[PDB]
Amino acid sequence: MPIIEQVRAREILDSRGNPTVEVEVALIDGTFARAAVPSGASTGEHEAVELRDGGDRYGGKGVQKAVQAVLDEIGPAVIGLNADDQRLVDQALVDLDGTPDKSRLGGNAILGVSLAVAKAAADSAELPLFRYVGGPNAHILPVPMMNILNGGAHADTAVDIQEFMVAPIGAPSFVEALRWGAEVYHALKSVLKKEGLSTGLGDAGGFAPDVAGTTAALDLISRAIESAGLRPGADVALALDAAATEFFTDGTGYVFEGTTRTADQMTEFYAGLLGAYPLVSIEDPLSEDDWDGWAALTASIGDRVQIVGDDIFVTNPERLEEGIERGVANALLVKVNQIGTLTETLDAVTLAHHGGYRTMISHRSGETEDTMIADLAVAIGSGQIKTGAPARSERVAKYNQLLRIEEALGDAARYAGDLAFPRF
Amino acid sequence: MPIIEQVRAREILDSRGNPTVEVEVALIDGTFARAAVPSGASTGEHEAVELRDGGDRYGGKGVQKAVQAVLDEIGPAVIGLNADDQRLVDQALVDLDGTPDKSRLGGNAILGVSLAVAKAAADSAELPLFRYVGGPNAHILPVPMMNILNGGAHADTAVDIQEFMVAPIGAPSFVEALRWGAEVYHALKSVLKKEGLSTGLGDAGGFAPDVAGTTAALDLISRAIESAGLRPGADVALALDAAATEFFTDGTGYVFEGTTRTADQMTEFYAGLLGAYPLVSIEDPLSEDDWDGWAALTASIGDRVQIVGDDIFVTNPERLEEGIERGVANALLVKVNQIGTLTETLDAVTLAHHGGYRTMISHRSGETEDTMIADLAVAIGSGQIKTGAPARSERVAKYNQLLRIEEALGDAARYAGDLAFPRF
Amino acid sequence: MPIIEQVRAREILDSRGNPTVEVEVALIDGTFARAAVPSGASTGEHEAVELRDGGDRYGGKGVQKAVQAVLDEIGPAVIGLNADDQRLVDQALVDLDGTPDKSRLGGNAILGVSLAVAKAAADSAELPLFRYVGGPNAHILPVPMMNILNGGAHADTAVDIQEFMVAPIGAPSFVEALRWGAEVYHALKSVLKKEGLSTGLGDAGGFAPDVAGTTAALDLISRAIESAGLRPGADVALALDAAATEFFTDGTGYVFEGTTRTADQMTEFYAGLLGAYPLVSIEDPLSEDDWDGWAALTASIGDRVQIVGDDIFVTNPERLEEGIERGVANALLVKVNQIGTLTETLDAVTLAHHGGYRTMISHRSGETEDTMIADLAVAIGSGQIKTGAPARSERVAKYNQLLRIEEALGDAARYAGDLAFPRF
Amino acid sequence: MPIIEQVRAREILDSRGNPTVEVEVALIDGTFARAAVPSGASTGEHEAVELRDGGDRYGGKGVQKAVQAVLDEIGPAVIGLNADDQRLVDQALVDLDGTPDKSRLGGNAILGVSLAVAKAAADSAELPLFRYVGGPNAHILPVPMMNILNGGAHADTAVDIQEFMVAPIGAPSFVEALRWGAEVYHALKSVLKKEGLSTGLGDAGGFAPDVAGTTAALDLISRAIESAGLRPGADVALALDAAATEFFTDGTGYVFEGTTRTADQMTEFYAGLLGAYPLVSIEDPLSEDDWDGWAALTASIGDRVQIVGDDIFVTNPERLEEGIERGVANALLVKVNQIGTLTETLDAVTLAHHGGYRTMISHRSGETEDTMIADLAVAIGSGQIKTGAPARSERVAKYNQLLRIEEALGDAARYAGDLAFPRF
Ligand SMILES: [Mg+2]
Ligand SMILES: [Mg+2]
Ligand SMILES: [Mg+2]
Ligand SMILES: [Mg+2]
Fold this sequence. Notes:
This is part of a larger assembly, with 4 copies of chain A. By secondary structure, chain A is α/β, with parallel strands linked by helices. Helices cover 38% and strands 17% of the residues of chain A. In chain A, the strands form 4 sheets. Chain A has a 9-stranded mixed sheet with strand order 5-16-15-14-13-12-8-7-6. The first copy, chain A, has a 3-stranded antiparallel sheet with strand order 1-2-3. In chain A, 60% of the residues are buried. Chain A binds chain B through residues 1, 84-88, 91, 118, 121, 124-127, 131-137, 139, 342-343, 346-347, 350, 353-356, 358, 379, 381, 409-412, and chain B through 1, 84-88, 91, 118, 121, 124-127, 131-137, 139, 342-343, 346-347, 350, 353-356, 358, 379, 381, 409-412. The structure holds magnesium ion (4 copies). Chains A, B, C, D: Keywords: Acetylation, Cytoplasm, Glycolysis, Lyase, Magnesium, Metal-binding, Methylation, Phosphoprotein, Secreted.
């Protein structure tokens, strides 16, 4: 019954106003599903390749070639397959491209199809997406890791740390956790007026105030948590995405808060912040190929704090395996578009989970109205999601979808809360 | 649509000819599913309680009280629930019993319903059981851990080790792995005739030859592997279930091969066998509450060999958590009937997998024609199953079901093979 | 509507771990049915031929050639036929083979299809298999003839009689009859410990104790019946399968309990046991082509005791006709795989029933999880089944299926009990 | 699905213009079936009781009380039952009447319902009636036993033998057998004109010529067979229904061809005719309670000729059992209305078939347009039917239905031919 009958794509805009791919899949039983592909502002070196058109149109970021690839080549390869055979469909897509990085049809063309197929299979089975992907034990609502203040390559300030997140770990439920996050984001606006700092927003929906650096930024978020009537750490803890590749010079070191520092010095710095602040997680504290520094840092602070690989793993099973052997990080950031299929995303989660590593499902800078990642975070029981500040519908659509999943689960829902961060 | 409409149970016989519970669930959409409950010959102290009738009938092992509980109390609690809400159904069963060990309605009455509901939900979604429970990424065929020679409480011999298993890790596919296992079991019969040793079978379908002890038994299996044209270790490795509670005296020590030994001495013994034999796994090397010995042994040999907790964990999240904190074992044996629900089984797998621990899905001595555990092993991607020697349909029905799942997965199937045992 | 649309086979394992054929049939109305083929350890000379692959694989017992025959030749001959036309389908299979013994496609390839078609027709009619084959008057639950102690070619002992069965004839219902059988099998284990005799199992799930011979074996079973609180004969009677071909030399005589004896002497021996023991049935008391001895023996004791032809008839209408004319035996053992189709099985039953002969539906040494024979025994109202000891799911699956049929029939069920053996 | 929803009866006329019962049954799935009850001109003492109204209407033979019983009592007892549970339905009817002979609601009210239910179940299963009752092996077309010349209580002539039948045993198919029967009946009319004998018809559609007696009558039928171009015996054999109760005086003897004779003398007479004429069957050669004579006669000629019990058995399992023990007759006449249910009819067939006895399905003098008995004769593989001369649609409707069943069976049809009468 859930036989793929039709596949079409169109060019749409992402939350930053740049083009991205949207796919629709129709099954012979009348099932219709739609999936949209996110896009990162700055991409890892090792991510799957997005096909972009080049030329004058949309500053060269058009995706009419990806749309044409879905119609000319991918559609004809998957019509007649069963939508339930996700692995067969993703294999057919990977084999049809024939490149390691999906540079021929584009990670953007292939992921659209992989996701739309998974959605059509779940509709066909009459199961919500989280249940279809995760089975009947998918019930864990994740701690929302909300980026309410920006630095690094996301601003023109003194702050080299890219994202400052709040984590409402002490909340009893996801519905309360979301409210705590909202009320801290609103308090932080009011505190930014109090100090004459800018309340202008950036791409991920958080603030970019021109502050001294890392500790200044943390101090303001602590204020905001207290302003909201919540206790820092016990109620709302903190996390960073250093995105340290962005302030790394190839062969050279970490140009960080007006000094060049070694992997080991960055480590000293981070251990500093652990002592002074309620930190549950630090993502990309060192750069995408700094294999020895990462190993050193994990060994130094990995018992004290979740260490998350983003750019170093790019959701890539080959790269995560290298890090697990090397004792590199204790968590994986999961970005479906880094790898290009749902199948390869879940193989990477499996390697992580079976390996002792936690997962954090992540948005991209360039998001869509698509909420698949809220379903995915519950499906894999990550207990953690990074999908933005509680402002901008490309962020809030995910939180709204988590409210809906929590409601659907009833007394079966469990909020990960402090059990996501047992090192804290 | 998949609303529970009717629930009935009956008394049937298990593979040992003792009574057990069979449940049927009908949904309002016409879906009908049947599940049978296995039973262990010797049970752990901490396992969920089976309701048995007592009295003259079937040596007191009747289950007409469990059948009556399904009709009088459980049926009325779950009619009207949705079969897809496994967690809601299992919660309703656990709340209705109201005991920690399921001593009021019986782990046997509750598990029948939990399993039959999961089967009816999968039929209703039109998904094979492994896909419904594991999602579209369920594709790993497990290494069959085949018990071809018995000792301990399963014989009256000098052999204190309970089960001697072959593991066809070097096979390219599950279909070949099964054949390798069969051909080694058949070769071992012929080798047992050659030495005038008995070829009479026991409960798990393997041999119980009266041999010197552990090393004698290993030597005969090595012969059999070679007799089959396979290389010990590279093609067919070995595993034990010591079931060391069976030769443990409370407060006293391990009465093992004509000596009382300490946890540490047992450890010396096991490290001995690692050096001399291609061992991938040892299960219950020490007793169900020997928390300090287990920790010591894991630390000593856990890097060299999978260490499996059976009786020490009884598939119980509270007990597995205690072992993970204490650094006790690196794998969990998964026996649905030890805990009493599918929900609590998957919570225990989740704790294991997320914790770095491997899983091995297990049969019970008293099995049925039911093949749910073949589906479960693929659903959770355990990469390992312990469901008997390749003789007796209560064992072979599971292997036959794994052939069927492999065939259904097509080029999406992956055989766990040597990737199940990275320490070897 | 019940038009055969698809036919596929696969290689699976039987209860002895040797390969056998499994067939699936799909009808255009969405009906899906599965049937598995049993296999005998030692076969009659005149049985339908099993195709086996030869070569190294599985000791030459592979059935990939039978699987290929189902896909290459049988499938194409029966797609488009109506599943309800069993006789047309079986004729098409017999004509396509074109041999008298089914040596071209294999009795194993043809029976799989014949059985799977009958199952799909019954599902399509929405009738349980026993009702579809036997009509609305199929309601007689058979006396289970349970082989709890082995001799002959099934052991290396002094006992030349192959099977010693208990028959719970005085039971009020099949559910009680099964319990009586179980409780006698369990009592007999305990009595075998008491005498230091082995409790190791053989292929049919019974014991093979090294005892003096026939009378010794009977004495132990009588003890076991009494140990269970039942009266020998009135509650639990006895039956033998001598399988006398196994101890016959072509042209020479019956090498039986350390003497060569004539057909007439064997007869004297059997008449001896009738006098001393509550015997309801003796199967193959003389060899497969000893036409004159059989006639002599039937005339001598046929009024005192059921005499069953197994190897002499091989469920073959041509051979049963020869025996009915010659006054040879008063019952037929019915083994679907001896003849190769359901149609030819029922033609043989018809000849038997219309001829005054009773029928006993039989398992094979190599069984599957398939329970078709429980349905067949009720469908033809045999009042007698031989499907093993009440241990091993390849045996117990049949007894469990008889419990289910009894339950489905309600107050319409009748237990054959002592009305199966009017000579006793 | 095939749940009995509605049951209604009406009064209709039989082939003799007397009232009889017609029943309709509707199932909740929309299945509608109609059955009519035959009636015998002269009934056996032991037959099930027909309810008749008494009074002026239709000479007291009205059945409005039977119609009222179906609406007032039987309908309410069987609405809600499953039509497939024939045994449960027939039991409910037998229990509701509560008499041994069905004298409270009438064998006529109960049989209508039993038959209409069986028809509705077969429609619901989408199986022709013969296949639903007999299973997929129902394929034997019976030899038509055609009564072309009447005597006894069916005429006012010198002929005490009630029915003279032709049996086209040497025909290759039922379609040819029917034609042979027709052509002999037509030839016999022409031969009756040649001798100035009457060609006026009686109730069973045959001739009643005023001839000398038995041998005269046989001689005329032989002529007719030859006149048709067929060989007596090899092509068309003979059978009688003596109906000897009709010429028996209680305690006294057999007033037969102008003499009072003993059971033994009747026997001498019959053995006489065997020597002189190609006789395959003689029905009721002695009276309904002449148990010792019947036994004597069977022993004398039973090896030479089928001996059929009609009035002595009345299709009654209790009475057939008495005859089988006493060695009384070798065949049973099967008249559904003698017993009152389909279930009890098939129990009687089962006892017969399993007992070495043949069956002959029979019409009644008072028949309807109903053809159920053609289906029943194939369903039970009787190989013999007695349903009249090949004239009158109450007779020919059955033959026409056998043509239809033969056509539907295709190359699966087998004509019983000479295999119905192995003694000839
Ligand atoms: Mg990042
Ligand atoms: Mg164990
Ligand atoms: Mg035999
Ligand atoms: Mg008559």
